[PDB]
Structure formats: C-alpha cells, structure tokens
Enzyme design. Structure first.
Site, short mmCIF file in Angstrom:
data_model
loop_
_atom_site.label_atom_id
_atom_site.label_comp_id
_atom_site.label_asym_id
_atom_site.label_seq_id
_atom_site.Cartn_x
_atom_site.Cartn_y
_atom_site.Cartn_z
CB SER A 161 -0.88 0.03 1.25
OG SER A 161 -1.37 1.35 1.46
CE1 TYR A 211 -4.65 -0.99 5.52
CE2 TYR A 211 -3.41 0.90 4.63
CZ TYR A 211 -4.17 -0.25 4.44
OH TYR A 211 -4.43 -0.66 3.16
CE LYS A 256 -1.90 -2.84 3.42
NZ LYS A 256 -2.29 -4.04 2.59
#
Ligand code: NA
Ligand code: NA
EC number: 1.1.1.138
Lengths: 267, 267, 267, 267
Positions: free
Chosen positions: D160, D175, D179
């Site tokens: 990502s 998050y 990633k």
C-alpha cells in the site's frame, strides 16, 4: 501550545543544551551500548537522565552512578520490558513522578532473529516483531500521551539499516521487517503528533558493543568488505545523532531517518 | 581497507568542536540564509571559516567581520562562481594557502526554476542543472583532491526535499532533478572516497530566509497546509545538522541524507 | 477533450494491446539491447514502432525490417542525438508527420562512465550528464508538447539501479548521478503532465546486452555474488515492463520506478 | 541452478501466459475489488485460479462462477482468515491437492485502522498488524515451503502507498506501519528465497473497489486534490501489475515495489 514552534535560540550550543530537560533511554544497560552512549551524550548536554534495564538492574545501576559522577546530573534506573504495554506505561508514570516531566524519549528494541521465515517458527516470528515493533509502539504510545498533554516532546526511535535492506548472508527477515515498520512508524507519528511532538528514527549499521568476538572471522570479513568504511562503527559515534534529535538543534526536523552505517546502504 | 577510523573523542563536545580545523561555506553572503547559519554554527564550534559569494561583494564582507567579532575565529570571503570549475579550483587553491587546509566543505548552490520543462526553454534547464548540479560537482571534485591528500575531510552537500518530491503547485522539475542528483551524488561519493572522506547531504524543506514577500500569501498557506508543523523552517534550525556532518560527531555516517522539512515528505 | 481517466478496457489483453498506437524507441539500433527488445514487445502488441539510431543507420534498418517481417506492423528508423534538443524535436516532428501521432515514448540515454569524479575530468562528467541526463530531458521535452496537444501520452524513461545505488567496484558517479536525476525526472514530470500524460521509469540492473566479453571474468563473478539471482539479466526480461508502462495496462501508474535488478538493491 | 533462471520465452505473449499454471488470490470475494481483478487478469492469461474469502463464501462463489464462464478455466474458492497461520497452512495444502501445485501467490491482507496511536487502544494496534503484517507473513511462509520444494514460484504481496507515506487527514499509523513492513518483507524475502522464487509488492494508492465506508464528501475532495491524476483508481487498473509479477514477463524482477497511486507519492 498551538503546534510546535522553532527554537528561540540563535546559539548552537544552546540548541543542543538539555539543561532543565528530561530524557529517557530504554537501552542504557550495558557499558558500550547504543543505549548508554545515548544517555552519555544527553547527560553531557546537562539533562537529567532516566535509564532502563530489561531484567538485570546491576549494569544499569553502575551506569547511573557513572552518569552522575562524571556529568554531575540527576539520573535513575527503571525496569522496562518494551514488549509489555503495562511495563512501558509504568515507566512513563514513574519517571514523570520522579523527574516531573519527559522532554525526549529514546526507545530501543533489540531482539534479534536467528533464521529465515521458512526455517523459523511462527512463535519466533511473532517474538521478534512483538519486541522490535510492538515494543517500539508501546514506548511511543506510553510517552506520546505525556507529550500531547505537555504540548511538547521529541521521540527518537532506534531502527536499523536492516529496515532499509536485508543483511547478507544472515537470514533475519522478521527483524528487518520490524525495523522497517519502526522507520515508517517514525514518519507516521511525526504527522499524527504534528501539533506537539517530533518523531525521527536513526538507522545504524553494524555497531560493535563488545560482542564482536561471538562472530566468525569470515563472517565479519565479508561484512567489512561491503562497508565502504571497512570497519564496524562504535556506539560513541551514535551519541551525536541521539542528542541532535532529542534537543532543540532540530526543531524543524520531524519524520526523518538518519542512516549511520559506514556507507553500507550506498551499494 | 581499512580506510576511515572512528573519532578519538569520547566526549560529544570534543566531537562537535571544530577547533583546529577549517571549513568553507558557499553562498553565505546573506544575513539569514542557510549559508551564513552554516558558517555561524561552525564558527561557534571555534573554527576558521572561509565563505564565498557569487557576485557583488556586499553581504559577504559584513559576514566576515561579524563572524570574527562574535566568535573570535579567523574568517575571510572569496568570490566564487560554483558553475565554473576553474573558480572552485581557484577557491580551494586560495583557501588552502590562507588557511593551510580544509577539513570540511559545505556545498550550496540554490539557483531556481520558475517554470516546467514544457514552458521553460532548454537554456533555462541548462542553467539550473549547471549551477545546481554541475556546481556541487565542481565543489566536490576540487575539494576531493585536497581531502584525498590529508587523508581526511567531510563534504556536506546541501540538497533539498525537492530532490525527493516535486513541489506543488509551482512547476520546477529542472530544480527538482538537480537536487535529486545532489542527493545521490553524495551517496556515490561516500562510496568513492571511502578511504579518505565522508560525504553527506541535507535536504531542507520550506525555509523562510527573509524573502516570503516575493511569494503570494495564497501560495504560502497551501505550502503551510502540507507541512505538518504548519510553518516554514528557519536557517538557524539547520546549523546543527551542518555542524553534525562536518565534525567528528558523525565519523561513521557517510552516504546519508537528512530531511529537515517540518515533516513535508511524511505525507 | 477530458483528462487522464482510467482505461476504458476491462480485459487485460485489451489494455496491453497497442493496436492502433504509435510508439517510439530511441535505444534500438542493434540486434540486441534494451532498445530493440522494447520495440519487439510493443510491436508484438500490434503497435506502429519508430526506432532511433545515434548513427550507423544500417543496424536500425535491419531491425525495422525484422519487426515488420516478424510482427507484420509498420515501422521506421530515424536518427537522433538525444544530446541535441533540436535533434529530438526534429525526431518528434518527423515521426508524427509520418505516423500521425505518438502515444508512447521510451527514452534511452546510453552514455557510460569509466571512472570516479577524481580521476575523470569535468569534460567527462559533462558529457555523461549531457547525454544521459539532459538527453532524457530533451526527449521528454520534445514529446511533451505533442502529448500536451493530444491530451494523452505515456513517457517511459529507462533509468538504472545506478540511480538508486553506487555500483561496486567500478567507479561511475557521473552515470549514477545522471541516473538518479532521471528517476526523479519521471516523478516530477508525472506531476507536471498530470492533466495529459503519464511518466514512469525503469531501473534495470546488470543486463547482458552483449558486452560482457570486455568486462573481466573476475569482476563479473563479483557482481554475480551481489545479485541474489546470481546472474545477469537479459533484455527479453525488460520488454514485459516496457509494454506495461506504454500500454493501457497502467492507466493509473504515473511517477513510479520499477526495479529490474535480480534483487541487487535488496541487499 | 544459479539462483533463478530467466524466462525461456522471447515472446511477451508467451511470457504473460499462465497456461499450465495455478495462482491463488487471497481476498477475491467482491465484484470490483483488488483481488478479484487480480484473479481475472490471471484467468485471462489461462491460469487456474484459486480465490479465498474470510467469510464471504457466497461472494467467492459468484466470482468462481464468472471466472469459469468467461475464461473457461478451472477455479475453486477456499475459506481463509489470514491472521491465522493454521488457516494459511491448510490453504496451501488444500490448493496443492485440488490443483496439484501453486505457481504464483497473491496475498492481500488489508484490514483498516480508523484512528491514530493515541486515541487507539493497544488491541487495535495489535489487530491491524496481526492481520496486515503477520497475515501477509503467514501466506508467505505457508506457500514459501512449497515454492522451495519446486525451485520455482512468484509471491505478489499487496502492500500500500501508505507503506511509503502517511495518509492525511485520517490517522492510521498502525495500518501504515503494517504496510511498511509488507513492502520490506517483499525485499527481504526476495533475498531469502533467491534460489527458488521471486517476491515483489504492489503499493496501490486510493482505489474505488466497492466500499470506502463513511467518509465526509469534503475529505474525499481533499484526497482527490492530492492525487495528480485527480481521481480514485480502479481495481481493473491493477490487474496488469499482478499478472506482470505473477508470470514470466518478469523473470529478472524480484525485491521490487510498484507504486500505483495516480502520482500521489510523487508530491
Ligand atoms: Na509525499
Ligand atoms: Na545494497
């Protein structure tokens, strides 16, 4: 404090000075580690220093004595298992209670991995990450609350060159990944805390802390041949980077990473 | 192989101190610019400072008088057009005779671009490249020879966050690419000069150097909303980094880049 | 005329297809090489291909013949000295006069370096930068104005891992630097040309284009031990990436770099 | 067998084909998600796809139905909760039984965060990392063993753009951190499995797949204005990249990252 401002100091020695300031260092348990060298410099700038040990306080008590006598500043040792959030919370609470505040925090999680993912178990993966990554998070979470309330603070996260590349020929992907997560955590929190605290990471290469002996003559020879400088670095060469980030010599530097690897990532 | 050894000082104050050393700074002919602040910091560390100026010997002289008066060290200006290899060559020839040596060299060349490549002409790209890229290269090569003899030296290349991302909404690809080149140039030279000199780059972000008037307050707010700290940097917030790289406080750091952008690159 | 939207194609074979489109390749001029393998892959996709030669047109004529007789598409050769803006602009004016348009442009600047900054001259630096850096700027600037008039286009610049790291043990900083400038040029231009064209770059590692005989075996065995794949790559391994960026298979990819180095930079 | 050997095919089409091969996509239970689009692209190339679902069995069933209709290829759905290593181990085992082998694995662990580190709980951090980072590790390890057993294989990890930067104005450090580790997991594993398989990652930017929860319209305008292309991406624009890394059109590409963010990271 509406956002973090620039240093009111024109003088460089004043930007670097940490008199009247408090700095916590999770390493600082051994004689020639990254941790105590971080404490050493900070104390040299005039800061009260708090240091932690994982399980054995002895080495940490002998450092506090050294830091007090040699630099003439307040210092104390505390227990901390970065892999436990409760332990890191207790750390921040007891320090703030004893020192009245915390201006800068230098976290350091150093569990190593001893294989590749395939050869290694899940537990072993989970471990390196829990400690190296979740460990750093706890440090940050625990002290970040303190920083938000004070409207100030500098978090310094010790990452690793291994967060940028994968060491050879040793397979330690779990470690490299937790370190990369550490580096990005520095960029992400730098932004999350943009109104009250600065966050930066230092990525050191091969540094000898006295355990070089436990490494095959070959292995070391191969590593040095990949390090343009051709020799391991020393912790005392990492003290300047730590004070630099913990002090007002970088009031505009946040979300940055500084590789200290002898040039290893250059190839 | 070996190549370069670690600092002989355990003390961090002795590491930063530039007593008994020579440092030259380019483009430091202004009152509050990245350049002068780099010379001020070094001078504060007690060092002989040589500065340079492109044209109109004005601000440079006053800086010279001011650096000797408030720091008590030797100084001197020098006319230099970094975009000319002969001028840099001459610069290092002269400094070396008036000072006896150059321990550190801080390279700075900030000509700018006011358009994109489609709107700009070929000449407009050539000029930004030659000054900003080839110039830094002229500094490096000219000093490199000197360093390669003394077996020691530190070249600090002032790059820019523009070597990392492309500024918005202003179009300035020529400038961007140029800085990117400086970023890697310092990385490639860290490797090439592994036996005698360290090379590092500093990537500043939006630094107010006293010329925000020449820019639309509308443009600033946009810049400000993309900078986590919500403001511009001040050249004084840069002195620490310059001093960090040019001294014995970073003897194991070569090939590194340090972004000082208030967090701009974080997003 | 809208802007830069997603491909109208749901099928992958339709996005990859370059049927009805015109692509120009500047490196192709020999039986092997990154350039020729790009043209073939695009031609196999059904595109009209125009290739360039620095001179010794015969080789470019051979290839044109091959493409047309192997893929059954129309193709032609032109002369282009990427180091000359006017040459590149004339290259565009001609292709369009004969093809009607240019959809994708794959620029390749081949100049090599044979020494470090200290041993090489300023003349040698300038050449490599003019050919490898400025020549790519010339290409983009030439095709950029055309892409702007049509509201579409895909510029693919062939950089190198040398723009990411410094090759060892050969010294070629000029090359490495020019290459870095090129990686960032595609980022900056992706943002400059945001309303009409995409810009991406390829950073290939050691590719056996046909000159391994010159490089000593000892040196080739050293490179191979530093590549996790432990071998050189082959230009046929590049055509996949080339058609990727030039075709609708990447209508949302712009400003990125794709490393094809056998995991070299991984270490 | 020096590490990994180059594709034997000169034809791009022949390199892109996945006939005689089997590929598995972790979360292809939706109509326009990243995974189902990866699963289509591969199917189209003639691959036998094996998609998984965390719970959406019915959703994974409509896809298998379709994948078998249009591409007339063998496809079967399986249940897998990536945060469980046992569930990934039985994923591989099963697929290997029904399809005899696995040639390419495409993992896509993407649970979201919804808050920053201070407002978030420790469990919230733990959950995102365990699924997004440890989840991805499980897939890699579970299928890894199999790849080393055949001396071949391609793992495409879906990271990502958040792995590179920090999303603004939403706070999701956990998050982003997960990633970041995934991106570096790909490079480190590329090196680890250098003798039998390639590993690469795709870092998509913002993608309209089906559900982007409840986000104010004004925030969505803010995102768009930071995306040079000025629009969200679609999943169909990601399929070419998945097939690229999954087939033989990328035989010398391992340890790389490919940003597909409409140029967001460009600024
Ligand atoms: Na950015
Ligand atoms: Na490397």
């Amino acid at each position: 404090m509406p956002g973090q401002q620039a240093t009111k100091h024109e003088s460089l020695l004043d930007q670097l000075s940490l008199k009247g300031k408090v700095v916590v260092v999770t390493g600082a348990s051994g004689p020639k580690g990254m941790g105590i060298e971080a404490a050493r410099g900070c104390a040299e700038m005039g800061a009260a220093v708090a240091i932690t040990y994982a399980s054995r306080a002895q080495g940490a008590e002998e450092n506090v004595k050294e830091l007090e006598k040699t630099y003439g500043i307040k210092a104390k040792a505390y227990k901390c298992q970065v892999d436990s959030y409760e332990s890191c919370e207790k750390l921040v609470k007891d320090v703030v209670a004893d020192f009245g505040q915390i201006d800068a925090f230098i976290a350091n999680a150093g569990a190593t991995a001893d294989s590749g993912i395939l050869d290694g178990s899940v537990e072993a993966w989970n471990h390196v990450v829990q400690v190296d990554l979740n460990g750093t998070f706890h440090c940050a979470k625990a002290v970040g609350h303190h920083f938000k309330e004070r409207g100030t603070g500098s978090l310094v996260i010790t990452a690793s060159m291994s967060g940028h590349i994968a060491n050879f020929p040793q397979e330690q992907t779990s470690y490299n990944v937790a370190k990369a997560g550490c580096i990005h955590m520095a960029r992400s929190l730098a932004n999350e805390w943009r109104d009250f605290a600065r966050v930066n990471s230092i990525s050191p290469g091969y540094i000898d802390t006295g355990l070089s002996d436990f490494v095959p003559k070959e292995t070391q020879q191969l590593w040095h041949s990949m390090i343009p400088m051709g020799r391991d670095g020393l912790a005392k060469e990492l003290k300047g980077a730590y004070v630099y980030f913990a002090s007002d010599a970088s009031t505009y530097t946040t979300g940055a990473d500084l590789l200290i690897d002898g040039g290893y990532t250059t190839r």
